[PDB]
């Protein structure tokens, strides 16, 4: 990784991240089969089987009831709407009785099937059958004459093992109204996700990536419940397709640049913080804090959460003083001392009335910082102290660079009125 | 549903929703009886009963220790404070020794009671008793002479079944410190919720509604732990009274309307987005993005999260260019191209340098969009593509209408300074 401190605007750009941007969805339609549990009944009263069988039946009936500018908010609302709308669009396609019949009849001869829905989308299909096999081959043999207080205690313990997955899928869909936020191990075993990843219509580059980053795959995806059908429960797991990969991405973090004249502060803060990537020659901004997740160099984002931004917005990283591009800032009379922790260092803003220091666990106070913004590289010190609050810096190594230049808040006068402004273009703050 | 695209301000209004607004709370004071588990002890050392008994005792001891403008933020906070303040008022009234005695004594003769508390509210009360029955009638007979390596292994498996509910209530209240965010199946079984709904002092309309929408009931409600009282734990579940029903509700969504003046962009975005309803001769706005939840035509909201807004605010949908009402907008020089997915279509803003298309899986590209805002009904296309990001449209069907008119961003000139503004009335953006 590489980090440039931008002294002109008290911001850092950390470069060298590799994109993994979610372009589409791969569907695995699970069929989980419970079987004729509701046709079984216990006459004996007190019984471990009866308690387990009643809990199994209750879970099945409850599942029958269940069925599905400040750019950060706007980008993540769009991303949430896009994901569920795409998923429901496939779900709507699978709902047809002829289609669930087709899936069920395919999985009647195999544990795995590929189906092309009438929508022309082709989906994987997977049976979960262990509970039906238990219910049909063993429990229905044990429950003779509706007797259930049987001495074969192994049956009751086994029953609580086989049904555990079913109860958890029911619980997760029941709690989440049928649209789970992440793919539980109960929805899709690792033995099934590895199989799904292998079957994806994707290059081996993504295959290597997706098998290594299985948790990131599992967390970017989601589930939709289709319904219950003849003692089988149908649900779909949506897996991410990462069709933009290895392109450049960089993160901007910023802290308040303030300066005093006539004894009074002028401050600016950059508002265009967060993740940027390049996609197909476009530059794309990911203003939502909740989407882009990082593992080493790889940054994982929903493309739906991206806002397209002119490539000239990079001029706010090199010539924010003089670019004609509307670099988005907030400004005012508000000198907030703070530490912006960054991948390879810290932006330390400290201003009148607040003491600011850096130090090491084995050396003590290494330096006392000047008023202003100090970029403390994470090799300079182990810690930063503000107001006696202690901040610990990252251990990760990398190149740190400084693009020297007179802070904008010093170079230009604040506009006399209205001096405080929110998320405005920089030409509107400074005269 | 019925959606009007409003070309004057790049916004849609989707109508036809039926309110289900939470006006009050119905309390069920659960008593859960654990019994004399603390008097039981095991001499035998290694035992399954000892492991389950020690887990039961530990859960009881830990539970003994547990005890309880940007209008979006302001509305969500007010609703959060209102709910917990409402519930704790009941808890304070239940918590009196004389009242928990009255509840406990009522539930000796029966598993269900109704108590009029001294605060004048009448609450349901429900006994959970299965664990005490197990502890007293069976386990105490099994643990003779403090022996716990009982060869009747059915006892240990049974014990793990009967105590499961207790451990989950403890876990949920322990993790949440006594105020659970939703009513778990462990707090309240479906049979208990259905019984509570039947008892609820409400019309048969809400009864049918609440039984069909049991998950929406279960998710709008919450629980509070009252405390532990010897061999028993007292907790209240709060169920939503839906005292405003079937009134008109509508959702506004908007995307950035921009126009090019001296080659520079002027933009506006409507910021009054989200849900609206008529309540009792007033229109009420629900800016809290987390509250209003939709099932079909029914929109489910907390009335405490509502902000009363003048009936004239509908003029921001009819005639935003000419109304004297202060229509809240943000404006500036910020041409963000994006897709605002909406119930019956999408708003698609695309501007200079961004390519924008609509397509269908079988047709391919149906059309290439003009710069500006296009309302794409969800019948015109399966998808919208921006920058090669593919957005998928809804499949739900309903009337789509266009209220034609020259965009405000074109028909009025932007104010020379300050041109960028946030949450301002529209007369402040355009001269």
């Amino acid at each position, epitope marked *: 990784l590489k980090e440039s401190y931008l002294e002109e605007s008290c911001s850092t750009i950390t470069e060298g991240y590799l994109s993994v941007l979610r372009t589409g969805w791969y569907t695995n339609v699970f069929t989980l089969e419970v079987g004729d549990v509701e046709n079984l009944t216990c006459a004996d009263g007190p019984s471990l089987i009866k308690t387990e069988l009643d809990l199994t039946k209750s879970a099945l009936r409850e599942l029958r009831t269940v069925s599905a500018f400040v750019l950060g908010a706007i980008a993540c609302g769009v991303a949430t709407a896009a994901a569920v709308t795409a998923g429901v669009a496939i779900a709507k396609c699978i709902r047809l009785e002829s289609e669930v019949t087709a899936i069920k009849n395919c999985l009647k001869k195999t544990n795995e099937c590929v189906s092309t829905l009438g929508c022309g989308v082709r989906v994987l299909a997977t049976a979960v059958r262990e509970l039906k096999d238990f219910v049909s081959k063993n429990l229905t043999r044990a429950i003779n004459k509706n007797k259930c207080d049987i001495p074969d205690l192994k049956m009751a313990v086994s029953f609580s093992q086989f049904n555990r997955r079913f109860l958890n899928v029911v619980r997760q869909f029941s709690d989440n109204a049928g649209i789970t936020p992440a793919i539980s191990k109960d929805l899709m075993t690792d033995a099934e996700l590895a199989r799904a990843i292998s079957n994806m219509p994707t*290059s081996a580059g993504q295959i290597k990536l997706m098998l290594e980053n299985r948790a990131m795959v599992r967390r970017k995806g989601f589930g939709i419940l289709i319904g219950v059908y003849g003692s089988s429960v149908i649900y779909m797991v949506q897996l991410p397709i990462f069709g933009v990969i*290895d392109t*450049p991405c960089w993160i901007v973090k910023a802290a308040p640049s303030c300066s005093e004249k006539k004894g009074n502060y002028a401050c600016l803060l950059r508002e265009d913080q967060g993740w940027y990537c*390049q996609n197909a*020659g*476009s530059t794309v901004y990911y203003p939502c804090e909740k989407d882009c997740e990082t593992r080493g160099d790889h940054v994982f984002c929903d493309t739906a959460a991206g806002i397209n931004v002119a490539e000239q917005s990079k001029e706010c990283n090199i010539n924010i003083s003089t670019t004609n591009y509307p670099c988005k800032v907030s400004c005012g009379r508000h000198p907030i001392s703070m530490v912006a922790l960054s991948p390879l260092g810290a932006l330390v803003a400290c201003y009148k009335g607040v003491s600011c220091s850096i130090g090491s666990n084995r050396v003590g106070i290494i330096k006392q910082l000047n008023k202003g913004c100090s970029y403390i590289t994470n090799q300079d010190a182990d810690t930063v102290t503000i107001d006696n609050t202690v901040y610990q810096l990252s251990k990760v190594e990398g190149e740190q660079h400084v693009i020297k230049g007179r802070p904008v808040s010093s170079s230009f006068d604040p506009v006399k009125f209205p001096q405080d402004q929110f998320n405005v273009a920089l030409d509107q703050c400074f005269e | 549903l019925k959606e009007s695209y409003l070309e004057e301000s790049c916004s849609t209004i989707t109508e036809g929703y039926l309110s289900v607004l939470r006006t009050g709370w119905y309390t069920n004071v659960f008593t859960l009886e654990v019994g004399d588990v603390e008097n039981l002890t095991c001499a035998d050392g290694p035992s399954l009963i000892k492991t389950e008994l020690d887990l039961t005792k530990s859960a009881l001891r830990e539970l003994r220790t547990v005890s309880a403008f940007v209008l979006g933020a302001i509305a969500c906070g007010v609703a959060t404070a209102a709910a917990v303040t409402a519930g704790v008022a009941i808890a304070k009234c239940i918590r009196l020794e004389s009242e928990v005695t009255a509840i406990k004594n009522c539930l000796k003769k029966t598993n269900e009671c109704v108590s009029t508390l001294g605060c004048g509210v009448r609450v349901l009360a429900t006994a959970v008793r299965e664990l005490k029955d197990f502890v007293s009638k069976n386990l105490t007979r099994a643990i003779n002479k403090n022996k716990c390596d009982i060869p009747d292994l059915k006892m240990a498996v049974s014990f793990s079944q009967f105590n499961r509910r207790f451990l989950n209530v403890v876990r949920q209240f322990s993790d949440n410190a006594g105020i659970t965010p939703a009513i778990s199946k462990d707090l309240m079984t479906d049979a208990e919720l259905a019984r509570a709904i039947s008892n609820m002092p409400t019309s048969a309309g809400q009864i049918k509604l609440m039984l069909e929408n049991r998950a929406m009931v279960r998710r709008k409600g919450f629980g509070i732990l009252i405390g532990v009282y010897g061999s028993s734990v007292i907790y209240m579940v709060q169920l939503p009274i839906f005292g405003v029903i079937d009134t008109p509700c509508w959702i506004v969504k908007a995307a950035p309307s921009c126009s090019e003046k001296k080659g520079n962009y002027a933009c506006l975005l409507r910021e009054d987005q989200g849900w609206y309803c008529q309540n009792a001769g007033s229109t009420v706005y629900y800016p809290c993005e987390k509250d209003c939840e939709t099932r079909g035509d029914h929109v489910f909201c907390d009335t405490a999260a509502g902000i009363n807004v003048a009936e004239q605010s509908k003029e921001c949908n009819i005639n935003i260019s000419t109304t004297n009402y202060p229509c809240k907008v943000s404006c500036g020089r910020h041409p963000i191209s994006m897709v605002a997915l909406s119930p019956l279509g999408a708003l698609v803003a695309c501007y200079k340098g961004v390519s924008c298309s609509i397509g269908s899986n079988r047709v391919g590209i149906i059309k290439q969009l003009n710069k500006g805002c296009s309302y794409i009904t969800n019948q015109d296309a399966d998808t919208v593509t921006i920058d090669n990001t*593919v957005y998928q449209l809804s499949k739900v069907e309903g009337e789509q209408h266009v209220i034609k008119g020259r965009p405000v961003s074109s028909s009025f000139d932007p104010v020379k300074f300050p041109q960028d503004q946030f949450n301002v009335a529209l007369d402040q953006c355009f001269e």
Partner: nanobody
Amino acid sequence: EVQLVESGGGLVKPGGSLRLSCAASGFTFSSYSMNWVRQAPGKGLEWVSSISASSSYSDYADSAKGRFTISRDNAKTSLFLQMNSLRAEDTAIYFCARARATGYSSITPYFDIWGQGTLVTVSS
């Protein structure tokens, strides 16, 4: 205009080595995956190799694997192909082509902008 411009094509003896070099211009080259596609005279297009945007991934056809090596310089906006152990079957026009994928249904790249093609002859 967006242009890809191959160079370094020429005559080689069997067993010889040659290094193709395609200059990219008019586009943000670091944003795109880049490929080599070859056409034997009177034959169809054979895919030769692919390199990802930051070179973190590369793939070769079974005829090229081990023999050839694709590389890119994102600063000089140039795509290269070292070819070792050339053969008569390697006599072809080689095109550099900008690869692009809409990963909605699947990740298969189309090739949108194509270079002029440079001709490689391999004969004794």
